Structure 1
Amino acid sequence: GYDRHITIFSPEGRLYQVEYAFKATNQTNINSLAVRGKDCTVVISQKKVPDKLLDPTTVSYIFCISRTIGMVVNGPIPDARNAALRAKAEAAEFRYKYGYDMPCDVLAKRMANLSQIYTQRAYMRPLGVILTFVSVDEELGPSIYKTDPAGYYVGYKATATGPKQQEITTNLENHFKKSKIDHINEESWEKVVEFAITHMIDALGTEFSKNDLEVGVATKDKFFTLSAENIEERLVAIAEQ
């Protein structure tokens, strides 16, 4: 049973260490979701600060990888920060060598290749994280690309990750079946954020205060995260209609 400890094939052609890395991905008990506007890409994630001795401003699973690219992680924070540091290094190196900003989909592929290597080389373990990369790409427009511990990645119209990803996924599917378009037909990112929070509330069946969420927004030439007060203003607008 040593085919269970390292990344070699089991008799059914499976990689158990990879499968168990997917299971570690839900250990934080956090759900995240990403959607696309006309001009923007929004990502939201639950925020849980269960200890009063914590400084809540330091608790985060959203990362500013480059000026244009944001990353939300589903998984434990040490592996999340490992991936974040590497992604930052790769994006900076790419710009130095090739003279233009690393695209969201290309970074996703690169991090997916690195992950593939950990599934084939025995001395390296997979990282127990799922990485959702967002930007407004200069060629492709609003972009969502997500990577997992198998080294798989793909682009999304919208996506969700975490223990309750299925509820959020089906909720999002139902909306897009109705609208028949690949995005939220909205001018402002504020409204795209409100859409994103609204559909997470419906899908999880829970309400949020300003400290229960984490929000990241990608626009042309920058990615930024919202403060508690920008989020409060979002919540207020949702309640008043």
Structure 2
Amino acid sequence: SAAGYDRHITIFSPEGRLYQVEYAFKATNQTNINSLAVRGKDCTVVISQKKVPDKLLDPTTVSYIFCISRTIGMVVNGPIPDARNAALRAKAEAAEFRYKYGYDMPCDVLAKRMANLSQIYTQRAYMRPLGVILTFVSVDEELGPSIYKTDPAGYYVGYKATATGPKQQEITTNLENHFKKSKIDHINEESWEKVVEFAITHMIDALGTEFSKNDLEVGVATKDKFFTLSAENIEERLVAIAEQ
């Protein structure tokens, strides 16, 4: 029920469960966006919804995909305060690592350390969980296309493809159908443009909702560079699908 428990993160229940942590898996659907990250054979694509619900905002600034470092992108689902705050740690650990060890920080090592740091925030009771799912994408300098999703508890596992947000279940199902049916673990194109197009299609299928360039934002990690596509760059892609 509740008797102390949920008011703290150093209080376990009869079950050994730490309740407050579970509330952040409910706190990351609070932006209402949904993400899709997919793998090809020379890229990883990560796509999130772009909500500009009042025209009193500038549709440009809106995004939750942040460039963390040259080779690392990241999508944030869940709150704007915790988005920036997690980006600060990520930006900083990525820079420090670069200079400590002299060499770039892999998708996995950035994913690993962010989780540990979060774990220590659950161990102590002057901190709290940052209630965001962070999905890091990079094309590795040694393991090629990669996706690591970091959950608010601080679990991390890799993926072929992944979805996040409230409407995750439908996207899970689509993506299962896709790789099962191919019997290979990746999208087969060697043109990164059609993989972005393909990612788009899946996303429309899974959600049931057709999109516009005001309702997408797209990040693309390729080997040795990262770029976020602008609105007119997305737009080009949509008119390839609609009439192939």
1:109-141, Cα deviation, whole Å (9 max, x unpaired): 011111111221111100010000001101110
Calculate the TM-score normalised by the size of structure 2. 0.97
Match of 1:80 among 75, 80, 83: 83
CA distance in 2, matches of 1:21, 1:204: 23
Q: Secondary structure at the match of 1:135?
A: strand
For structure 2, the residue ranges without an aligned partner over 5 or more in a row are none
- Offset of 1:95 from its aligned partner? 0.7
Shift of 1:40: 0.4
Residue in 2 that maps onto 1:93? 96
Contact 2:43 2:139 survives alignment (8 Å): yes
CA deviation after TM superposition for structure 1 residue 29, in Å: 0.4
SS of corresponding position for 1:144: strand
Q: Separation in 2 of the partners of 1:92 and 1:117?
A: 21
Alpha-carbon separation, structure 2, partners of 1:225 and 1:65: 12
**1:204 CA displacement:** 0.5
Correspondence 1:174 to 2:185: no
Asked if 1:19 corresponds to 2:7, the answer is no
The 1-side partners of 2:76 and 2:43 are apart by 19
1:147 deviation in Å?
0.5
Alignment partner of 1:142 is 2:145: yes
Asked whether the equivalents of residues 215 and 225 of structure 1 are also in contact (C-alpha less than 8 Å), the reply is yes
Measured in 1, the distance between the counterparts of 2:5 and 2:206 equals: 41
CA RMSD of aligned residues (A): 0.9
Instruction: Give the CA deviation at 1:181.
Output: 0.8
Q: Supply the distance in 1 between the matched residues of 2:153 and 2:18 (Cα, whole angstroms).
A: 9
SS at the partner of 2:57?
A: coil
Residue 200 of structure 1 is matched in structure 2 by 203
Q: Match of 1:208, SS?
A: coil
What percent of counterpart residues are identical?
100
Alpha-carbon distance between aligned partners in 2 of 1:4 and 1:163, rounded to the nearest angstrom: 25
2:8·2:125 contact (CA, 8 Å) conserved in 1? no
SS at match of 2:157: strand
Distance 2:110 2:238 in 1: 33
Once the two structures are TM-superposed, the CA of residue 2 in structure 1 deviates from its matched residue by 4.1
SS for the counterpart of 1:11 is coil
**2: CA distance between counterparts of 1:7 and 1:80?**
24
Could you say if the C-alpha distance between residues 187 and 3 of structure 1 is closer, same or farther in structure 2, counting changes exceeding 3 Å?
A: closer
Change (3 A) 1:20 1:7: farther
7-16 vs 66-75, which deviates more? 7-16
Paired residues, what number? 241
CA distance in 2 between counterparts of 1:19 and 1:118 reads 14
For the residues of structure 2 that align with 1:48 and 1:3, how far apart are their CA atoms?
32
Q: CA deviation at 1:4?
A: 3.8
Shift of 1:7: 3.8
Q: Is the 8 A contact 1:8 1:122 kept in 2?
A: no
Cα distance, 1:6 vs. partner? 3.4
Partner deviation per Cα, 1:1-25 (whole Å, 9 max, x = no partner): 2454434211111111100011110
Deviates more, 1:2-11 or 1:203-212: 2-11
Q: What TM-score does the superposition give when structure 1 sets the normalisation length?
A: 0.98
Task: Describe the SS at the equivalent of 1:52.
Answer: coil
Partner of 1:69: 72
Counterpart contact for 2:67–2:73, Cα < 8 Å: yes
Deviation string for 1:189-210 (max 9, x for gaps)?
Answer: 1111111110010111010011
Q: Any runs of at least 4 consecutive aligned residues in structure 1 with deviations exceeding 6 A, and if so which?
A: none
CA contact (8 A) 1:7 1:17 kept: no
| Distance across 2 between alignment mates of 1:195 and 1:70 | 20
Distance (whole Å) between structure 2 residues aligned to residue 3 and residue 163 of structure 1: 23
Contact 1:8 1:120 in 2 (8 A): no
Which ranges of structure 1 fall in alignment gaps of 5 or more residues?
Answer: none
